[PDB]
Scaffold this active site. Structure first.
Site, PDB file in Angstrom:
ATOM      1  N   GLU A 238      50.837 -96.525-103.155  1.00 20.79           N
ATOM      2  CA  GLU A 238      50.745 -96.528-104.623  1.00 20.79           C
ATOM      3  C   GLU A 238      50.290 -95.150-105.143  1.00 20.79           C
ATOM      4  O   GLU A 238      50.115 -94.229-104.355  1.00 20.79           O
ATOM      5  CB  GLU A 238      49.819 -97.659-105.120  1.00 20.79           C
TER       6      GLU A 238
ATOM      7  N   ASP B 272      32.460 -75.501 -83.027  1.00 24.14           N
ATOM      8  CA  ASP B 272      31.438 -75.931 -82.059  1.00 24.14           C
ATOM      9  C   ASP B 272      30.071 -75.469 -82.568  1.00 24.14           C
ATOM     10  O   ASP B 272      29.204 -75.085 -81.786  1.00 24.14           O
ATOM     11  CB  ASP B 272      31.724 -75.401 -80.630  1.00 24.14           C
TER      12      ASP B 272
ATOM     13  N   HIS C 123      44.038 -92.417-105.538  1.00 24.53           N
ATOM     14  CA  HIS C 123      44.734 -92.406-106.824  1.00 24.53           C
ATOM     15  C   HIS C 123      44.544 -91.089-107.580  1.00 24.53           C
ATOM     16  O   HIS C 123      43.881 -91.025-108.619  1.00 24.53           O
ATOM     17  CB  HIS C 123      44.357 -93.630-107.658  1.00 24.53           C
TER      18      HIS C 123
ATOM     19  N   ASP D 173      41.458 -94.075-111.316  1.00 30.66           N
ATOM     20  CA  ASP D 173      42.846 -93.614-111.496  1.00 30.66           C
ATOM     21  C   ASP D 173      42.959 -92.467-112.511  1.00 30.66           C
ATOM     22  O   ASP D 173      43.723 -92.552-113.472  1.00 30.66           O
ATOM     23  CB  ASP D 173      43.735 -94.788-111.929  1.00 30.66           C
TER      24      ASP D 173
ATOM     25  N   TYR E 108      31.143 -59.402 -85.992  1.00 34.69           N
ATOM     26  CA  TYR E 108      31.345 -58.478 -84.895  1.00 34.69           C
ATOM     27  C   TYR E 108      32.096 -59.250 -83.819  1.00 34.69           C
ATOM     28  O   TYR E 108      31.626 -60.297 -83.376  1.00 34.69           O
ATOM     29  CB  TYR E 108      30.001 -57.989 -84.342  1.00 34.69           C
TER      30      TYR E 108
HETATM   31  N1  LIG Z   1      36.414 -56.078 -82.240  1.00 34.84           N
HETATM   32  N2  LIG Z   1      35.735 -55.352 -82.794  1.00 34.84           N
HETATM   33  N3  LIG Z   1      35.108 -54.647 -83.421  1.00 34.84           N
HETATM   34  C1  LIG Z   1      34.239 -55.446 -84.287  1.00 34.84           C
HETATM   35  O1  LIG Z   1      34.910 -56.730 -84.532  1.00 34.84           O
HETATM   36  C2  LIG Z   1      35.551 -56.616 -85.802  1.00 34.84           C
HETATM   37  C3  LIG Z   1      35.788 -58.069 -86.247  1.00 34.84           C
HETATM   38  O2  LIG Z   1      34.583 -58.851 -86.071  1.00 34.84           O
HETATM   39  C4  LIG Z   1      34.463 -55.907 -86.603  1.00 34.84           C
HETATM   40  O3  LIG Z   1      34.976 -55.348 -87.811  1.00 34.84           O
HETATM   41  C5  LIG Z   1      34.067 -54.794 -85.647  1.00 34.84           C
HETATM   42  O4  LIG Z   1      32.686 -54.474 -85.836  1.00 34.84           O
HETATM   43  N1  LIG Z   2      35.126 -79.513 -81.463  1.00 37.85           N
HETATM   44  N2  LIG Z   2      35.164 -79.468 -82.589  1.00 37.85           N
HETATM   45  N3  LIG Z   2      35.379 -79.479 -83.695  1.00 37.85           N
HETATM   46  C1  LIG Z   2      34.883 -78.267 -84.349  1.00 37.85           C
HETATM   47  O1  LIG Z   2      33.429 -78.187 -84.197  1.00 37.85           O
HETATM   48  C2  LIG Z   2      32.850 -78.688 -85.415  1.00 37.85           C
HETATM   49  C3  LIG Z   2      31.439 -78.059 -85.542  1.00 37.85           C
HETATM   50  O2  LIG Z   2      31.462 -76.625 -85.754  1.00 37.85           O
HETATM   51  C4  LIG Z   2      33.855 -78.268 -86.480  1.00 37.85           C
HETATM   52  O3  LIG Z   2      33.726 -79.041 -87.679  1.00 37.85           O
HETATM   53  C5  LIG Z   2      35.156 -78.634 -85.800  1.00 37.85           C
HETATM   54  O4  LIG Z   2      36.226 -77.838 -86.328  1.00 37.85           O
HETATM   55  N1  LIG Z   3      46.013-108.432-104.137  1.00 39.34           N
HETATM   56  N2  LIG Z   3      46.485-107.427-104.318  1.00 39.34           N
HETATM   57  N3  LIG Z   3      47.026-106.451-104.470  1.00 39.34           N
HETATM   58  C1  LIG Z   3      46.059-105.338-104.618  1.00 39.34           C
HETATM   59  O1  LIG Z   3      46.168-104.756-105.937  1.00 39.34           O
HETATM   60  C2  LIG Z   3      47.233-103.771-105.882  1.00 39.34           C
HETATM   61  C3  LIG Z   3      46.889-102.617-106.833  1.00 39.34           C
HETATM   62  O2  LIG Z   3      45.867-101.790-106.273  1.00 39.34           O
HETATM   63  C4  LIG Z   3      47.305-103.277-104.428  1.00 39.34           C
HETATM   64  O3  LIG Z   3      48.640-103.466-103.943  1.00 39.34           O
HETATM   65  C5  LIG Z   3      46.330-104.173-103.655  1.00 39.34           C
HETATM   66  O4  LIG Z   3      45.110-103.463-103.384  1.00 39.34           O
HETATM   67 NA    NA Z   4      49.161 -91.578-111.058  1.00 44.57          NA
END
Ligand SMILES: [N-]=[N+]=N[C@@H]1O[C@@H](CO)[C@H](O)[C@H]1O
Ligand SMILES: [N-]=[N+]=N[C@@H]1O[C@@H](CO)[C@H](O)[C@H]1O
Ligand SMILES: [N-]=[N+]=N[C@@H]1O[C@@H](CO)[C@H](O)[C@H]1O
Ligand code: NA
Ligand SMILES: [N-]=[N+]=N[C@@H]1O[C@@H](CO)[C@H](O)[C@H]1O
Ligand SMILES: [Cl-]
EC number: 3.2.1.55
Length: 448
Positions: free
Chosen positions: A189, A331, A253, A13, A424
């Site tokens: 909380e 991706d 917290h 906390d 690019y």
């Molecule tokens: N589109 N386009 N052109 C390319 O893409 C811009 C962004 O990646 C770059 O500045 C440039 O090289």
């Molecule tokens: N689909 N999907 N999710 C994208 O792909 C993951 C891997 O680049 C990234 O964390 C997420 O934004």
């Molecule tokens: N039993 N019980 N209560 C617990 O203690 C309190 C404080 O964190 C929360 O409400 C819960 O986690």
């Molecule tokens: Na607090």
């Protein structure tokens, strides 16, 4: 500008207050739940090694004599105030909110006056008092049982008459009813307030204090009536939660502070580095205090990302010629893009190069053990398989920026010298740089 986590072992906390005397003050819940500790330091990192003074200990009998929980320190109208919760020796579960006051310049050495219980209309389980000012008007927010509800605590807000006394009547502004708010216990909380761009953001903790602990958030306009429940809109998903990838469990917290320059908002919170609690949950002492920077989305809302891996915090890299666009993966393909909602896709930590010889590598914040690497001159975020080929593909020599040799950064491929990381068509590649545009396409800034 980076932090080394954790900031403090066995401190839950956490509350950090930055005062005008150029010090940060840090208080927290201790595992024995028996006292209120305080430390100070000129920097956030300084806090990790600053010695703790015990400023107040529980009473031997009656009220303020059990479960000393979640202190907060504030400077208000020339005096120090500490908000905390406590039960009594007789009833250890009759937790109520209390306030200490000191007039001393330095709160670590001063003496403290008990201002008593913060009275509320309902006599029920209450804790986690925080105070904050919106348009010069001081409010209190806290967690308390609404006895007509089938749950543990809901969130309340009220105006204040003085730092230990509410004015008028409380408004209940959130109750735990979403599935992620109701795991183990139905809990709202630890309210915490940050203000930005004419909005009030009130984060709070939800579910049991196990791996299910997380942050939700309420949002309101600073111009609205904060005592009208209708001014507040609850986020339907947690804004901060367990990350198994980074080995960070039940973050919550929280409180908010600011960077040394006053330019960045800092999220202060606790978590554990393991999933399953051993023993009585209450008796597990292992929660630790952590810090990471808060980033602001284009729409004005805060982005907390994910709880980052232990050690040094990751950084973001923006483009020289598109200063709003950040290196991020999607991706697993690396690109530059503005207004990254999935923040951790654009965080990388700079580590010693996988291929040695003074090079650097860029490890993913949300996929530890995955690194920016090129293949067929395209840049991807891929898992290090331990092969020499990967290590060569994921290592870069840091160079002065090609379009800004003072502040910019460029990244020369280790195994393809003369080829730089450049965008690019927004996709990241490694390519030679000849033209002025090339040089701009290959220049980046870290945390500018
Ligand atoms: N589109 N386009 N052109 C390319 O893409 C811009 C962004 O990646 C770059 O500045 C440039 O090289
Ligand atoms: N689909 N999907 N999710 C994208 O792909 C993951 C891997 O680049 C990234 O964390 C997420 O934004
Ligand atoms: N039993 N019980 N209560 C617990 O203690 C309190 C404080 O964190 C929360 O409400 C819960 O986690
Ligand atoms: Na607090
Ligand atoms: N050429 N070739 N081979 C591939 O492309 C090289 C540059 O990305 C990488 O080292 C390798 O993956
Ligand atoms: Cl996104």
């Amino acid at each position: 500008v980076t932090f080394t986590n954790p900031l403090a072992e066995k401190r839950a906390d956490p509350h950090i207050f930055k005062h005008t005397d150029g010090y940060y003050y840090f208080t927290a819940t201790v595992p024995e739940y028996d006292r209120i500790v305080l430390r100070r330091a000129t920097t956030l990192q300084g806090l990790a090694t600053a010695p703790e003074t015990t400023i107040w200990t529980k009473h031997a009998s009656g009220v303020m004599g059990a479960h000393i929980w979640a202190p907060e320190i504030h400077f208000i109208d020339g005096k120090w105030y500490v908000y905390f919760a406590a039960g009594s020796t007789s009833d250890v579960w009759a937790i109520r909110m209390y306030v200490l006051e000191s007039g001393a310049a330095n709160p670590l050495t001063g003496s403290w006056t008990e201002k008593g219980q913060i009275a509320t209309p309902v006599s029920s389980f209450s804790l986690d008092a925080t105070t904050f000012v919106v348009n010069g008007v001081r409010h209190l927010a806290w967690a308390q049982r609404n006895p007509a509800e089938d749950n543990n605590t809901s969130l309340f807000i009220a105006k204040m008459a003085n730092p230990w006394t509410i004015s008028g009547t409380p408004t209940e502004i959130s109750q735990p009813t979403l599935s992620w708010e109701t795991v183990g216990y139905k809990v709202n909380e630890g309210p915490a307030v940050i203000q930005h761009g004419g909005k009030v953001f009130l984060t709070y903790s939800a579910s049991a204090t196990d791996a299910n602990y997380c942050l939700g958030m309420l949002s309101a306009s600073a111009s609205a009536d904060l005592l009208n429940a209708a001014s507040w809109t609850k986020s339907s998903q947690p804004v901060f939660k367990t990350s198994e990838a980074t080995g960070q469990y039940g973050p919550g917290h929280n409180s908010f502070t600011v960077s040394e320059d006053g330019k960045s908002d800092i999220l202060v919170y606790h978590d554990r580095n393991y999933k399953d609690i051993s023993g009585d949950p209450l008796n597990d002492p292992n929660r630790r205090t952590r810090l990471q920077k808060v980033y602001w989305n284009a729409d004005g809302t805060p982005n907390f990302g994910i709880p980052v891996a232990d050690g040094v915090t990751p950084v973001r890299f923006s483009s020289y010629n598109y200063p709003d666009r950040y290196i991020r993966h999607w991706d697993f393909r690396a690109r530059i893009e503005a207004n990254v909602t999935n923040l951790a896709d654009s965080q990388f930590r700079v580590v010693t190069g996988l291929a040695g010889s003074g090079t650097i590598s860029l490890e993913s914040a949300n996929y530890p053990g995955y690194y920016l690497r090129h293949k067929n001159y395209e840049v991807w975020v891929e898992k290090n398989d331990g092969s020499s080929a990967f290590k060569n593909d994921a290592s870069f020599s840091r160079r002065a920026g090609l379009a800004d040799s003072a502040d910019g950064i460029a990244f020369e491929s280790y195994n393809y010298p003369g080829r730089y990381l450049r965008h690019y068509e927004n996709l990241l590649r490694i390519q030679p740089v000849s033209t002025a545009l090339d040089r701009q396409d290959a220049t980046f800034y870290a945390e500018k």
